[model samples]
Target: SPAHPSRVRVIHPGGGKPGGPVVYWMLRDQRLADNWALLHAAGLAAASASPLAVAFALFPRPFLLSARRRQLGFLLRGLRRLAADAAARHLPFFLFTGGPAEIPALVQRLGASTLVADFSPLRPVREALDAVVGDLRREAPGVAVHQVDAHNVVPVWTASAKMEYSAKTFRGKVSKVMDEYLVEFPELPAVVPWDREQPEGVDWDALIARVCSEAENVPEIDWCEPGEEAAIEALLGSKDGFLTKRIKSYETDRNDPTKPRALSGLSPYLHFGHISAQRCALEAKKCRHLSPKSVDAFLEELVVRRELADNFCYYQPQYDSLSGAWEWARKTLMDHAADKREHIYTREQLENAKTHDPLWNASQLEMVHHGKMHGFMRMYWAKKILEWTSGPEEALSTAIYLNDKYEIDGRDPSGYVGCMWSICGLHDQGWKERPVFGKIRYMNYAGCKRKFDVDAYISYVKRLAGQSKKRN
Candidate 1:
């Protein structure tokens, strides 16, 4: 079947005219298979007797350009493989030097009548899409525009009418409609061969190496490989696969700071959109007989909690700031604004791993060197930022800065909400009052010590940092 009608929302209702090409301006969801936007593009073009083309631009305005080598390297290298896949299928894959601003010209050059895009909840990406859509309306009025929710298992808007209060509420709502949106993908439609000039060939090795030099040696992660094929293997490979070999332990050790392998290890792939969250859910369900407890917990995180991050960003324009906190959150935060602190660390000290806390330095270095961090450690890390800073605002921004620069999966809806939930005080319910934290949830070293072997985790991180020094 064509993409379910609910999966798509028309951004511009020019009532699409026929006679030109259909272009899928690829963004967040970069894979070729199991991609609704790409499938929808093929569907649209086939029906209109039109050629289909895929286009991408590295909009450095914020995301790709501002991203360090850790992220930019993963994105470019991943896309390089997708480009080859598209080329093999005889599909035209256009790569632009600049990002979103040039999209209007690309549509005009192709005389494309319709533009299809995948969605991102991040403010910068939203602004970029809005600009492209706004420009198309003024300059290319005939073009029809649509935004597809290819990333989430449940589209953000479809899951609820507004920014969700908690995952429990969001989960209750999503559980009611799981069968509809979460299903198998159709085979890609056949398309007319593009008659336009062949896309210039990408010298991937040279391009990837060039971008690597630009980051001043923030090395890409070595432990995990990137791209679609690798993503499936990371999830279900016969050896060291999450579901096949390790999910049994996930229910017990997934949160242990020292047992990093106990987790699914799918965040980087999920963050980069190399694998579909919906697909992940579908596959996990097939093996529910193996570990129902672990499967259910993983689903809650992947589908409900993660998508709610998108729900927050999509509805709350102030999603990244203190301004986005709820009234109770705001009141409690300001009430304790001037509370005295035991220690306050400068951003530089925190970034340089000069902090007095052993756990803090270990978590910081884990992201700096490994290009990833344990999910459970994220809360304690942010809590300490608030503990060491004068206010929640600084803590939020500092966490965002370090996380975005270091974590391979940073600068995403989840990353923002990770800090927001930890420091900004929403996407979670307000908790019992504390001295510096107010109603904001708090964590301490003692709690972590009780939860896992903190010393072992610190030692593991130092081993990782040592390995990074040797490789890149």
Candidate 2:
């Protein structure tokens, strides 16, 4: 079946002759099920009476997508499973070793008439896509290139016309039309027998071992398993699954840092594209009757806020910097740039969790040791960076550097937007003026103490970090 035309965008409408194989360039979205780009590619192949294949370009170390070993290890392991799944469906999966500059030649060599790619809003990915599309036009003028917004439930461009002012401004637009897009995926079409010789099956063990070896410093994590099967089980399995068992308490417990079990813990899966956010939303919607408030709360974050992050990074070129903030935010931050700070720490001191504040230290340790931080603490954690650093620019850079370097879900749009919102008030409004913060919101230990058990959080992180240190 042909994908909805809304989901597909023609990057290069040069030629559309039938017979040549179709290639699905797997990038942001890595799974077989619920993948619109792959389905679109399959539909093209079926229409042309040609075979379908998938390809992944493996960027080497110090990559923009990941600087650490943990992220790369998880991604490669998941791809290994994806290759096996593609094989089971009779589709060939090829792993390449270059950037977008090298992909056009690969598509031509494979005799592919169409190139389909998944979507991402990150600057690096967009730049790569632009280069690839331009290369294809010049080199393989007859081949058509298409891109699908498979990552977002409601396509990012369709959700809003410009950078949204805030979640409040964007929520109604998405909610009104979400039902039309948040539907189930069709079953994948089986691949027809091919006459051309296929690439040899990937050496899964050897590839995983080699990736792990390359990323020796940032070893793989034991807590969250990687792959589509694990992602599904973590989301919907009867045994302690978020929707099946835990969602009932989410509305109340999610804000409490000590209640770590209350979190959906789905960001890692969602981040890697092992599972679809639409699938998770659809399943949760079914169980809405059991806990309407919790279901609604979860969906608000899942759809509205998550998509809003992409919106920011997509439209704002300076998304990771102070220049991306709203006019009021930028003016206010500049007005208070020279205001004296109560305490100042270098990036090293902050990264090592050597701050004098126990709560700040605890949050830093949590992210460092577990590769994740409580949602509530992330705000408090980032705000402290702004308050303690020399100014907003250095603080923003340090926060992004630490976040992208450690967290498994680092190097994501959400992380960048999150840091921006905390430090520069990107989507937030101005508050009453103050020293060092000006009109930007201010957070303090006393404020956190009123919200939840600050000491307990510190103690919990201390113990958790100690245990992690012993294991390492």
Candidate 3:
């Protein structure tokens, strides 16, 4: 692929200024090894005879799902691990919080000839990046800004010009070009030696002060540590212990809420780009004990279904809303506009996991207190939201709000796509004719009861909630 859209800027700010800094403003791709963006930055630093200074911006404003204590812990742990890894590479990493309005000015003050940053495809990040890029262009005229696709195995833009309507459509396009971009990992260029001595300039206290003080009380969660170390460990180990026993019948079992450990809980890690989809696919191939069908199923999700989400969100700007649904689903739902809900609850009641159904409550509790639920449970969780809300539009909003506000790995293409699939019918077939759900997929508590240990999952959530109350 020719240069990506984000990497087209050729202007080098300081123009071969000796001993200047090249800033690696880390964001989505937050790791050191096997990261195309970081490696790209390192190569530029080597060429410029400069050191790469790594930095991350943390915002005080609400994160989509990270507001809940359970999800917040994962990011905090990941950030700490990220800092340690940067230090190990002899790079300086700083954490800044609150509004990033002054970031271009800050980049100017750092005397960075060029800023090399990773890319985020989500709309919110794109909005922030657009302003920052424009500000650098108009205000900090001397600082060159560049971005790279470090998140996808086959870069999103390099694969397609617009969002695809379905995975089947995207699969053909990606498969045609996958060979070109799916080459083995690039070699890690050696870390360049810094010509300028370290400055006595880092102010840890001031930086910490800038961090959202409200975030200090962010509760530690039960998920694995957030850094590359913890992520790799889970990726390698978490699958076999419970997943092996259950996943052989995955196609059937993955939809059941009781099967907590049945599906791979790797979505959070993948969502954060803490791990790559390519890595997961490579490892799945190495699972000697997995049945062929099961391995294929996992690979299908890792590639096709995963990209299906990117395709939907990339093409459909209104992906978070009901309008992103298929035409048939939109029409069918509207035809049944007068259908009655068995129960309706306020957003507060829904968020606190206080609905009449124990199973629905359990699913909400898992997301609220623990940051995520099993894939099967997530479907059940979202379908219930559809049943309880006034309309598909309102239901989509509530489901996404809970998902994005509390799940550590919430707020990605996967979450949005998953929410829509469970509630709004993206890439789905009509279910047994039913009330409220119509042709939309339906999940029920009785179905969950027939599967895994529902009582155990609820008890676990109670334990989490109890602990959280004590801490507060």
Candidate 4:
């Protein structure tokens, strides 16, 4: 039941170290429970007879890893509860306001022998981690560093050897090994309680206020509370949990824009690592008797499609750009580059939700003010950008900027892959040739009306947007 061997990757081979503490620099996988990275660190500590500690570093500077107030507040607030949970388990939780540069000094100060980290395929996160691991390699030669893919049910590398062609291809590879990796987490190995150099208490209230005030364009969402305790309730609460109350309709209504409640409202939780995808899948499987069809559909997206994003970003260097598209997609996009557009909107116009399409405007406003757009709407939203923008390049960047800026679950591999899949057909097969889209798939307003109640969705967003306005 312990984490499998392939779950952990050696970042820096640091063998032959004397007894010292083990440090886990937590990132993407932020929760205290059901976390493979934390469990592995505890096991390592237990084996070495060393104390285990957890640390989270917030990127201090701006530009490269700029987090809006909404994201910052949720993460810090979630950590506030997470730190308390760690204390109950006698694990020391350290918070650093600086970037990963602070890791070397923290390891040195604690005289730690090993370091563990959470894995994310995003370039900025990967780059920050690489720099720290590289620094430890050069400066502190004997310190060991490793990474754990705590976010996915299957380790990204083990799921596939190379960049997967599509979900159809990746799905087969993962299904082959589901029984091996999909199971309950074993008890965290017992380690010596932290008795030396205890971390100072954090002023969570003041910290949350100060950090959130830095930028308020996307303020914290009130509907979905933060922290792991809340995350579990959202998934399995007896009163109105996703599994208990809303799952039956999911098979039939998940795609309907008017049936938002049918969807498992777990994206923000999953995105911030408040809940594990493995945990979600495990719980859904348990409730398979309630709705086999719903459970099967949920597993498809939760395991196959979600991990597909990780597989692509981990292997593809240009994941966030149009250049990352496959040869056929890239060539097709370039071929139709000179095609005329019916309505060309600048990034500003798109961001402002000032476009001619009320349905597209509703989707944009939903993300802008409500923090999340409907799942089905995101595909249609991104594809429309391709049709409306000057070309594929502008369309891709415009989609990325707006997506990352507005969606609560922005700046993630899923978001990047969504934009790429919609705009560039990264993992998607080409469709019938069209005016502006060439071979890339296209979505028009009429297509959305055929699937869901567009007028109802627009009015629902109009009301929700105003509701957020008054709350602020």
Candidate 5:
């Protein structure tokens, strides 16, 4: 059995011919280290005495509605780093412009017998993977395809069979199996030299320029650096790192948008697969004795709630739409659909941060300019969208659109679930019925005032806005 047997699922059932190249279709889990999918592929190659290589299909811009130059730039830069890392590790890395449709042909051309990919619950990614698997199953039946849940600490399927009602339902299931699935990764054996032709080197600067030109509307951000090395530094580096110093205040200060340092700020890395959630969890557990309350809060989010989001998206087909809401949530929202809002704003108005509420406007502007919203502010931001829109449906659409477009961590499982939870009550219970939200949980300026210093948050956003303007 493999090191993490539950992590590996055979996407296409069959065995590849022996002594052929083992190709890893690198997608969600992009980093070289601590990646279960890549390790699994490496293991297959070593066992069969075959060569191992990595391939990435580069879809052009407008690839995703929320996708723009910013996200593409980050991913490309990281892949560039990966290319060097893989080469040093005696592995070949290939990058080309195409979709899943190109993968089977490439496998056939390379005479590769196996295809391995990291798991993603997102509908688009799933559909693309299924398309590739279908092609291999039909055209190249001998080619084996396997999927590994490298992103989640506990494999989503292993955690639950059906949609979990909420984090409470999910926590118990995942905690029970954490010991078995969350074990440390085994070291990978080096692949023997390849006799086949190697892939062409990428023109990274040209690729970056081309992608940037394709997405002129959304420019790249400069605040956070990209790649696995940077992600490690952010997580455990000696100075001002999360586990080193910032985590002590996490439980106490996380809810305050003004205190940005209190958060781990690892969402972009995690979303892009530069760092493993398991790696983060393992390191954090070592520091548990430092601050039990903060460590517990952090782990709940890292393991329990994070995996719950993946479970929701994987099981619920309508994860991105209003129809995906719980039956109670759907009925309550529809009942109040006709009720008018205090202020109805269009998507354009929201995007430009032209809202009348200072707090909402600040949060919107923060995301627009900085490429991320504070975690606490994200809940308020989405709920306010519901408050200001005509109905739940439009509110959900608008919130997701803005989130996917502006957030660096946008278009991810966590992002989708966050929006769903905020607007459609995907994981929440009914609250006191209101005109706009009905039984859906509601958030307001008063709630923000009570929880944190609203005026201070607004002022902090004002500073951020000015800094953005100066840079621009």
Candidate 6:
């Protein structure tokens, strides 16, 4: 079955000619089902009796913060499943090499009259879109570019543009209009197939082969598969069990690093756009008992925390930096710049998860091997990075780099913004000044010790790390 198409912003509006084919450029949303962008393109193509094709541009290097084969394996597994689904819809899912620089030329050569593309709110993706749109307008004058909003239940522009003070403000806005946008999938138009003899030099297999090559380090696929069906199923199943129970205690357990299954693992799906934020909200609403703790806890992370993270990156150019710390945090950190550190470690030592603190070392090791660290441990992880590094600047860069390299959900605006917020108090208030940490949150080995059985978490991580090493 083909996915439904939604509104404008993530996918662009124009392309080839008045009556020419519609091209859907697949980047973020890689599946055939529930993708409004693809549906929009298919309908546009059907209207014009033109073939619709979806394309992905493969870049050798994506970003300076992080891009490693470790993360690519999962992405490709999902992409392959998505490609197969696209084939079923009779939409040719072409994988192309080269960066954004060549996309405009390729679109023009394909004889596309209208191009519908998915958008990325991150700085780099936005820049690429801007550059591509300019070149397309000048060189391919007849093409129309319309971008659709694929991420939010409400479009980013529609949700709110300014850095929202807190999720409290943002949630109200989303909740008020949630019913309007949270909806069943739209019917997909019959796919317009592109079977005109393959254009010379197009190699779908080789491009696919390159993406598959990155999957070497990821182990046998686990509880989740990479496509739309698997993502939605994971969410529904969790809401039935883990989320339902943990959500009742979420506001409390969400802060404790030692508790297992404290939060929903729906983040990766949300990050990949496999499921929309609105979809999560809609399903969560269906929970039978609907504990106040569960509802408020879910809202806190999904709305307040998530939006806070987005606003940080959206408003500040250097959101992941120590310099981008909140004014109170920045001022305090500078005032205490000369404060003596209790300990310091080299970047290599930190990357290898070699630290004197057993719990911290285990958290780092878990991230390296499993591609994720526990929600609670993440705060401690960032604070330790600040304390053990030479300075705040080095700490922020090193933490972001390591996370982006390791975490499946890393390199996202939410992840970086949250990491920075943990380390530098980006959206938080000033607390008492302390050594190394300044006015930023201070989370030490002792603090973790007082909260829960740190030894159990350490032992458990050690076991997972050992198994992961065996697999690697």
| Model 5 segments more than 4 A misplaced | none
Q: Model 3, range 223-265, lDDT digits (tens) per residue?
A: 4567777677766756453233455776666665555665777
In model 4, the clashing pairs are none
lDDT tens digits by residue: candidate 4, 1-472 = 1569899998887865757889999989889889999898888889988988998888863523467887787788889989989888778998877677887778878888899999999888899998988888887878989898898889998999999999999998999999989989888898887866777688889877777777545777778888899999999999999998888878788889898788898999999899988999999999999899988998898899999999999999999887788999989988888889989998889988999899999999889887888898999999999999898888888898888777778889999999999999988999999888999988888888888888999999999989988888
The predictions' CA RMSDs to the true structure, in order, are: 1.5, 1.4, 3.9, 1.3, 1.2, 3.6
Across 150-222, the per-residue lDDT of candidate 2 in tens digits comes to 8898988788989999999989798888888988889767667765647666677887676666664765677
> How well does each candidate superpose onto the true structure, as a TM-score?
0.97, 0.97, 0.84, 0.97, 0.98, 0.88
Local accuracy by lDDT, each model: 0.86, 0.87, 0.70, 0.87, 0.87, 0.70
Q: Which wins on lDDT, candidate 3 or candidate 6?
A: 6
Q: Candidate 6, residues 1-472: lDDT per residue as tens digits?
A: 1233335753344433566767777776666656677777777777778787777766654422345665565666677677777666666766655677667776777777887777566777778778888888778867878776655556566666676655667676766766666676676787456854343344445654565454334443344566676777666664454444456776777776566677677776777777666567666666625676677678667755775566557667777777766677888888877888878998999989888989989999878887778888888898898888888888888888888877878878887876777777766666777877778878788988888889988988888888878776
> 415 in model 2: Cα distance from truth in Å?
0.5
lDDT of 2 at 39: 88
For model 3, which pairs clash? 64-404, 64-405, 65-404, 65-405, 65-406, 163-315
lDDT of candidate 1 over 390-437, digit per residue (tens)? 998998889989998898888899888898899867767888998988
Q: After superposing candidate 2, which stretches have Cα over 4 Å from the reference? A: none
Cα distance off (Å), candidate 2, residue 222? 1.2
Between candidates 5 and 6, which one is better according to TM-score? 5
lDDT of 1 at 274: 95
lDDT at residue 409 of model 3 (Cα atoms): 73
> Model 4: residues >4 Å from true position, as ranges?
none
Off by over 4 Å in 3: 1-20, 63-68, 195-218, 237-253, 288-291, 431-434, 447-472
